[PDB]
Ligand binder design. Sequence first.
Ligand code: CFE
Ligand code: CFE
Ligand code: NAG
Ligand code: NAG
Ligand code: NAG
Ligand code: NAG
Ligand code: NAG
Ligand code: NAG
Ligand code: ZN
Ligand code: ZN
Lengths: 482, 482
Amino acid sequence: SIDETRAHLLLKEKMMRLGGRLVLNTKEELANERLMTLKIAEMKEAMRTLIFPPSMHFFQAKHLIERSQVFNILRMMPKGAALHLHDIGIVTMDWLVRNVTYRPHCHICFTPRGIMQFRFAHPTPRPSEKCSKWILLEDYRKRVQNVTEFDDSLLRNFTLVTQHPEVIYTNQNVVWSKFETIFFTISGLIHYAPVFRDYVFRSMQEFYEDNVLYMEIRARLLPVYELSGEHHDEEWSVKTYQEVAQKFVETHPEFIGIKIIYSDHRSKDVAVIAESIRMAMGLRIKFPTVVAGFDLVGHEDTGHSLHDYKEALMIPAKDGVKLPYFFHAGETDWQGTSIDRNILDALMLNTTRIGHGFALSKHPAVRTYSWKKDIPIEVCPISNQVLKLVSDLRNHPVATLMATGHPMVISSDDPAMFGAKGLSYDFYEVFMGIGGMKADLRTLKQLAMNSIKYSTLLESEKNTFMEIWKKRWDKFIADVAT
Amino acid sequence: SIDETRAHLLLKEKMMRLGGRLVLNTKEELANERLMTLKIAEMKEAMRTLIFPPSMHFFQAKHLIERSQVFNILRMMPKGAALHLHDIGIVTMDWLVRNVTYRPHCHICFTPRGIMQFRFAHPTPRPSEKCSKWILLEDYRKRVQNVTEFDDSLLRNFTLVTQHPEVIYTNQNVVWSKFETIFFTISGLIHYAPVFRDYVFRSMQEFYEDNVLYMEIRARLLPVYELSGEHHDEEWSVKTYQEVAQKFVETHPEFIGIKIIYSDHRSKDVAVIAESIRMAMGLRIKFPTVVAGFDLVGHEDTGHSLHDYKEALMIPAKDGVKLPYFFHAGETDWQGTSIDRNILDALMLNTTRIGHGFALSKHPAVRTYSWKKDIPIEVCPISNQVLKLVSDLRNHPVATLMATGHPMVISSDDPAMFGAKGLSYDFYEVFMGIGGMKADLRTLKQLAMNSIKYSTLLESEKNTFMEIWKKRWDKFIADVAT
Ligand SMILES: OC[C@H]1O[C@@H](n2cnc3c2N=CNC[C@H]3O)[C@H](O)[C@@H]1O
Ligand SMILES: OC[C@H]1O[C@@H](n2cnc3c2N=CNC[C@H]3O)[C@H](O)[C@@H]1O
Ligand SMILES: *[C@@H]1O[C@H](CO)[C@@H](O)[C@H](O)[C@H]1NC(C)=O
Ligand SMILES: *[C@@H]1O[C@H](CO)[C@@H](O)[C@H](O)[C@H]1NC(C)=O
Ligand SMILES: *[C@@H]1O[C@H](CO)[C@@H](O)[C@H](O)[C@H]1NC(C)=O
Ligand SMILES: *[C@@H]1O[C@H](CO)[C@@H](O)[C@H](O)[C@H]1NC(C)=O
Ligand SMILES: *[C@@H]1O[C@H](CO)[C@@H](O)[C@H](O)[C@H]1NC(C)=O
Ligand SMILES: *[C@H]1O[C@H](CO)[C@@H](O)[C@H](O)[C@H]1NC(C)=O
Ligand SMILES: [Zn+2]
Ligand SMILES: [Zn+2]
C-alpha cells in the first residue's frame, strides 16, 4: 500500500515532466532504450569521477561533450527550429578570420583605447577620431614573423572562449563588457555587403548541417555598406535576408527559411526606442512575411526596464496596430527587483515568446499565467553559464519548469561567441544537465515539436514543417535503433 | 484593466510567499519599514558594485556580512529554535584551540598518513598501530619558535575556512574528504569527559548569545572517555546531555533546553545500521524526553540510499514501535537518480522533518505530498555553498519553495566548520539571498515561529515556548522601530 503510494508519486512525476505523455511507437521505444543505456552509462561514470560536462564551464567541457555518444546522437537529431538567435553570433569565427580577413581591401585598426576594429575600403580610409591609422591586412601579414599566430590572436579576440574564465571574467559586468566589445569588433567585417550575404548564407549552412530547418533571428539591422562608402537602410537588409534565404531554400528544399525579429538596445532613450517601434511597424507592413515583430536586447540588469519604455511600447496599441513582441525578460539572478518583473510586463504587453525567462520559477503567479496563455520561454543554457547567471547547469532554474512540463523551446543564442555551433550543444546541456537522468526521447521529441508549434509561421506552414520534420524523425529513429 | 491584472498578480505573489498572510501590528509595520529601507539600500549598492555577499563564497563574504546593518538587526532577532545541528560542529573552534588544547594532559599525534589527532591521557598512552608516538602539547608548545603561529596552524586545520576555496576544494569529493577529516581530528579533544561537558554547555552559550532558545542535535554518541582510559556508553552520553542542559537552563531560565536525534553514518552495512536502530529504540524507551529519534548522516552521494537500508529502517514498524525519523535527504545536485529519490523514501518512512531537501523543487509530486502532510525541510544555506551544491545562493532551489510558502525551517548545520556562529549568518543568507528583495519581516517572523511549530516538543511546551518568544519578539520590534 505504501509501495503503491511510492509508485504513484513516481508515475505522476513521469507523467508531468516535459514530453511525459507522448506515446512512443515500438521503433521509438527501441531507440529510447539504446539512447537511455548510453545516457545512464555516461552519468554513472560522471558520478564516479565527478567529471560531468554540464557542471563544468562550457569552455573546459566542450572537448568532453564532443567525445560523448549522447552528443553524437543529438547531432543527428532533427531539432526543428532555432528560435532565439542574434544576427552576428551564429557563424563559427574560424570562417571570419581564415576566410573574411583574407579578402581584398580588408583594413584593421585600433581605437585610442586599443579596441580592435575592421573596415573594407578602397583606398585606405582617412584617419578619424576613433582610429589614428588604418592598415591593410595584406601589408600587416607580410611584416609579421608568425602569420598563423597573428591569425590565432584574431580568433581569440572574436570569442569569449578562454582557459580560466573564472579568473578572466571576475563578474557579470566584466563578461558583458567583453561580450559587447566582440560585437563592436566583428561588426565592420560582417556589415560589408558581400560578406553580409555570405554570412547570412553560411549561418543557414551551419544550422542546416546541425539538422535544424528554420531560424528566427533578432536583428539590429545596422547599416550595411559598400566599397564606395554608401550605406544601405533597414528595408535593404530585410530584402537581403529574404533574398539570401530564398537562394538557400532553392538548393536545400527541406529548409523552411528565416524570419527576422527587429531589435534595438535597451540602453537607449524612450524617444529613440519610440522611433525604433515605428520602424518595426513599417517593416511589418512592407514585409509581413519576413518580419515577425520586435524585441529589446542588451544587458538587462544595467539597462532600462520594460516599464521604463511603456510610453513607446504602447504606440502600436494606440494606433490600433498589433506589433508582435518577443521580449528578453528576467535574464537575471536578482529576485523581487525591477529587472525580474520584466517577465510580468512582457506578459502584460502580450509577448508571443519570452527570451530566457530565467527568473520565472521564482514567480509562481506569473508562471501559472504564462502557462495558461501558452506563452513559452526560450531557454539558452550555454549563454546563461557563459554570462555567469549560473555555474553548474544542474542548478539551472529551468529544471523545475521541465519537471512540470512548462511550455519552452531550446536555442543557442550566440553559439559562435561561446565556441558552440548550431543547436546540439544546447540540447546536450538541457538533456544531460537540466533535465536530469529521467529526461528521455519524449523530452527531446516534445522540445523539437514545441519549436515548430511556437514559431511565427502560418498554421498551414507549420503543418508542412511538421510533415518534413516527421520524416527526418523516423530516419533518425531507425538509425539510433540500429 | 490590464493594470488590474498586473496588480492582481503582484498581490497574489505577495500573499503566497512565506509569511505573506501574517498580519503585522503598527509597531511591527514601523520596524518593517526601517528594516526594508536598510535592506533595499544595501541591495541597491550591491546591484551597483556587484559586491553581493550571498553571491560570493561565504569564506570571502563573511567580513562583509559582519559590516551589514541588516545582519546586525538579525543578530538581535529572537530566531526561535535551531533544528538542524550536529554534535561536534556547533562551537567556535577558537575555544577548542585557545582553551581546550591548553588543558593538562593534552597529547598530539600524526597518523602514518599525516592526519592530526588528539588524546587526553595520564599517564601518556602507549604507542599503538595508528600512532607511533603521543606527544604532550605542553612539551610541543615549548619546542617551537612561534607559538601563536603554531596555534593559528591548529585553528586552520580545525575549519574549512580558507582563501581561494575554488582552488583548494576542486570538487565535492575533495571538500567532503577535508570535512570528514576535521571531524576525525577534533574528535579526541571533544570526547574527553570534562571537555565534553564544557563543549555542550558552550554550544548553548553561543546559541543563547545569538538569541536562539532551543536546540535539536544530530549526535553520533561516540564513546566519551576518562584520563584512566575508561569509555562510557550511549546511555551515559544522553544522560550527560540532559544534565548539562538542565544546568544551563537553571542559570538561563528562558532557554528551553536540548533534544538529541541519534545518528549513524550512511557508509555502513545494513546489519550495523540495524544494530543502531535498536539502540535508538532503547534510547527512546530510557529517555523519551531527551531522545527525539533517529537519522542517517554523511556524504549522501557516495553512501547507501534509504532504500538500501529498508530492511533495517522497517525494524520498528515490524516490532509495532514508532521510531521517529529526521532523515537527511536529497542533499545533491543529481536529479532523477537513486540519491534524490531519498526524499521520496524519507516521506514513505514517515519522516518528521527532511534535512536539506535540496532536490525537492525538481520533484513536483513529492513537493505537493510533503506540503500536504505538513513535513518541513531544514534549509542550511551556508553548508550548501561550502559543500559546493551551489555557488551563488541567489540560485538556491529553496527560493522557489519560499515563493509558494512551503513549510521550512532555517538552521546552520555545522557553523563552526564554516566560520559561522549560531543562526544569524544563515538567516542573513536566506533573507538577503534566497528570499529576494521582497522578503520582509513577515518572512522572518514565519521562519521563527515555524521552528517552534516543527520542533519535537510537546504541544504544551510549544505554547510556553511561543509565550517566551513573543515577549522577546515585542522587545525586538520596539528596538528596531527606534
Ligand atoms: O545584435 C547584437 C546585440 O544583441 C544583444 N544580445 C546578443 N546576445 C544576447 C543579447 N542580448 C541580451 N542578452 C544576452 C543574449 O541573449 C547584444 O546586446 C548585442 O549588442
Ligand atoms: O557527527 C558528525 C558527523 O555528522 C555528519 N554531518 C555533519 N554535517 C553534515 C553531516 N552529514 C551530512 N551532510 C552534510 C551536513 O548536514 C558527518 O558525516 C560527520 O562525520
Ligand atoms: C582583445 O584584446 C584586448 C586588448 O586590449 C583585450 O582587452 C580584449 O579583452 C580582447 N578581446 C577578447 C578576449 O574578447
Ligand atoms: C494586449 O492585448 C489587449 C487585449 O486585446 C489589447 O487591448 C492591448 O492593446 C494589447 N497590448 C499591446 C501592447 O499590444
Ligand atoms: C576555559 O574554559 C573553561 C570552561 O568552559 C572556563 O571555565 C575557563 O575559564 C577557560 N580557561 C581560561 C584559561 O580562560
Ligand atoms: C593541517 O595540518 C598541519 C599541522 O599544523 C598544517 O601544517 C597544515 O597547514 C594544516 N592545514 C591547513 C589547511 O591549515
Ligand atoms: C508509516 O505509516 C504507515 C501508516 O500508518 C505505517 O503502516 C508504516 O509502518 C509507517 N512506516 C514507518 C517506517 O514507520
Ligand atoms: C570563402 O568564402 C566563401 C564562402 O562563403 C567561398 O565561396 C570563397 O571561395 C572563399 N573566399 C576566400 C577569399 O577565401
Ligand atoms: Zn538573446
Ligand atoms: Zn546536517
